[PDB]
From a paper:
Cryo samples of extended CCMV at pH 7.6 (containing no divalent ions) are prepared in the presence of a photoacid (NPE-caged-proton). The sample was plunge-frozen at pH 7.6, after which the pH was lowered to 4.5 by releasing the photoacid. The capsid has a diameter of 32 nm, with the disordered RNA in its interior not resolved. The reconstruction is indistinguishable from one obtained without first lowering the pH. This confirms that the vitreous ice matrix has prevented the particles from contracting, even though the negatively charged residues whose repulsion keeps the capsid inflated are likely protonated due to the high proton conductivity of vitreous ice. Once the calcium ions are no longer present to compensate these negative charges, electrostatic repulsion causes the capsid to expand. We then dock atomic models of the extended configuration into slices 1–12 (extended and partially contracted particles) and of the contracted configuration into slices 25–30 (fully contracted particles), from which we determine the motions of the capsid proteins. When we prepare CCMV in its extended state and lower the pH to 4.5, melting and revitrification of the sample allows the particles to partially contract.
CCMV is thought to achieve this by detecting a change in its chemical environment upon entering the host cell, which causes its capsid to swell, increasing in diameter by about 10%2.
Numbering used by the authors:
A (entry chain I), F (entry chain I): 42 to 187
B (entry chain C), E (entry chain C): 43 to 189
C (entry chain D), D (entry chain D): 41 to 188
The structure:
């Protein structure tokens, strides 16, 4: 299905391939705004709902977990505070934060939040593809002259 | 058992699975059935797509398959698919009600690809990948020419 | 000059068959093969309606050229002696309409029993005659629903 | 004997094309060129309707002469094998009406795609055949107002 | 912006200006546009005539032009013209609403002439003499012949 | 004043400083889409009205003219076909093409149109600043997942 954005809101996405990691190692994955949103005016737009989900190779065995939280000094801790976790054990490998981050600016979103990934077994580059939604108000612009 | 839309009809065809080694993903090409291979018909628009497997009773281990836009690496196809057809589930099938709406049979045959994964080795015919496609009810010429 | 509307519930399928090389006055038999799109067994049991044959000739095709569709005859020449209508080059319209002679048979029967017979007074080189064939028949119906 | 009224909103444009010299049984291709008066780009996008071709022969033109308008074929002779109507000298009326085969294309498409094919059993000298062509098409419209 | 009469249509075409020396008048011939060059069309009757120039941004000095009955001396044409198209005015144009009513395109092409004057020298293309003509809406054959 | 865009339309701008030019020389000025519009989807948006106007140094003497037209093999010719010209002699040094380019895509706009500038006196870099508006439909985007 599709979950339509709120009136006056838009959606953005950007993904990041997982880095190599050993057994049960939790790794941190960075968040960077896309070039469309890196503009000054767009940076100030307020965020709405959010959604996180993973793309796993068909051979990905063991348990794999990921979530988005305010950056924790230790990577593993984030799960212990995340309001939801994307876990491969579930039928749908996703996790929605419908209101956790409502009200922050895209700048804040990219500044303090981060993606955390955990795998019981060892990982290799490209093993896990991290997908992310960011609902926010529509960027807007209009002008004239003389 | 699922009914088709008004103005649409379902075409069904099968493809065998090539021999492959353990844990290695393979690709299976989509070739249109004869009654759709005519130039008039392949221009038709697609609706919903249904994929469901048939396994030999001896099939063991894990087997997964999905149809997606052709990807450079076969394994990666499982990372953009809406629904996967997996043997560990009750019904070994998947549905793509929204993914491929609007595509043409030309594009369906040329762009998509059936990707199949097995934890263990496979031998030819070990899996029968059945594919079912909704599309506009094909139309036929209904008059003779003068002379 | 006219467009023979097909009967309600019927459609028209059209395909060609290039003539094989032949010598003067030699009658040749051309086999009728169903098009791929109809070749499915599901469709093979459909009931034929009106049948129409008409030729296309190279402008340099001299002499007399005749063709008709009949149940396969032991001798090729004999076919014309029973055909109710023959398409000829010399006539105004090079065609032959069989509104009733074959109604009721199955497309499988059409492929198995009937044959296209072609005769040229002068020698024919391949492609000199393009035997067009237009078969009206019940509209084939595709599967209505998925498989659970 | 008859005057085919053009459709409402359509007009008829008529022009000729003298035949080039040719040898016996040689099929020749004659290029279709729009008349100057229609040649404007503004008009080139007009949609064609019915098309009519008919020949004029010197009274001494013996043998058989055939001509038809078809999408350009790789081999000139083949054109007749697909033309739905052919103008022949031997028939009562040396003409060929295409009421539908070309409806919908643009005059630019008409100039680019179709070709006039001509065949004579005997040798032709220049001007022996005057291929008249009459193309019905939407009425061109001129500018309604000045430029300030 | 000016509307044409009922039963009339406007044909517009342009003519470039030939190189000429200072203060010397030149003549420019009127040639019918292709869509009017057919024998049927050139018999048509004319209505109002509009002349207006386009100057290169570098054009300096005085430039004048008018269309009149062909005169033996080019300069003299400015002495019988109703309105002149001059560059010193706001709009570099002229109008001949009554002068040429009733003339035929044959006569318009054969009798009139576009005369152009410049205080300074001109180089080819330095002026684009646009001409706009009202005339009876040309009519087309609307039926095929028997055979 | 300000001339509001049409319902569902937006506005964009981008300027270009004049190059050096000698007396009465007409120069050509290129048009390049901004990075916001260089994206594939935005490129297809249809244009509406347009406006051109200049910024002159206070010392700019003589006559200066500019206009936007389909590229002409010779630079000077463009004026002879422009539906309006921005000329310093007027009170407001501007020229509006309210409908000349309506219906083309931003790609077409950047491909075939070009800016032409003419100065009776010699010019130097920065002497003339060419300002341009491009009204067009709003770029739009919206998405979802699983």
């Amino acid at each position: 299905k599709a979950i339509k954005a709120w009136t006056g809101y838009s959606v953005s996405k950007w993904t990041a391939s997982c880095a190599a990691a050993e057994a049960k190692v939790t790794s941190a994955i960075t968040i960077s705004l896309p070039n469309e949103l890196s503009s000054e005016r767009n940076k100030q737009l307020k965020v709405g709902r959010v959604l996180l989900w993973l793309g796993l190779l068909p051979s990905v065995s063991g348990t794999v977990k990921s979530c988005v939280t305010e950056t924790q000094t230790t990577a593993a801790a984030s799960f212990q505070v995340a309001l939801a976790v994307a876990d491969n054990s579930k039928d749908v490998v996703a996790a929605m934060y419908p209101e956790a981050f409502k009200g922050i600016t895209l700048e804040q979103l990219t500044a303090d939040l981060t993606i955390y990934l955990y795998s019981s077994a060892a990982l290799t580059e490209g093993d896990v593809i991290v997908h992310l939604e960011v609902e926010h108000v529509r960027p807007t612009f209009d002008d004239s002259f003389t």
